[PDB]
Amino acid sequence: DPALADVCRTKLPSQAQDTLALIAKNGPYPYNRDGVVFENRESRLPKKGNGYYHEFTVVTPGSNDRGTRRVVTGGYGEQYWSPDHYATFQEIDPRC
């Protein structure tokens, strides 16, 4: 499989848009876990080979802690948003 919901890039929180711009430039990244492989063990994203997906933190400005906001990239430049630490995903639509 079923489709994921879509979110327009310009409808993302500003910090999420900032993270997409960092990914496009290959960093630098605020967190040491930025860029590590996302294994997708439970297959909420389409099942792919080892290392296809990577995860990045999106800053939560009003908290002291890292927070739950994430972007996951795929190997063909697909981008996914998760506001809730991977419980839900939306595919980012770069066109809008």
Indicate if 85 belongs to the active site.
Answer: yes
4 CB-side CA count, 13 A: 19
Indicate if 55 belongs to the active site.
Answer: yes
Q: Catalytic pick from 39, 42, 78, 85?
A: 85
Compute the Cα dihedral for 73, 9, 13, 21 and give only its sign. Answer: positive
Resolution (A): 1.5
End-to-end, the C-alpha distance of the chain in Å comes to 25
From the list 6, 7, 28, 11, the residue with the least C-alpha distance to 19 is 28
Which listed CATH number (2.70.180.20, 3.10.450.30, 3.30.70.20, 3.30.160.100) goes with 1-96?
3.10.450.30
Beta-sheet pairing, 79-82 with 90-93: antiparallel
Q: Catalytic pick from 42, 55, 78, 91?
A: 55
* Method used to solve the structure: X-ray
Compute the Cα dihedral for 87, 32, 7, 63 and give only its sign. Answer: positive
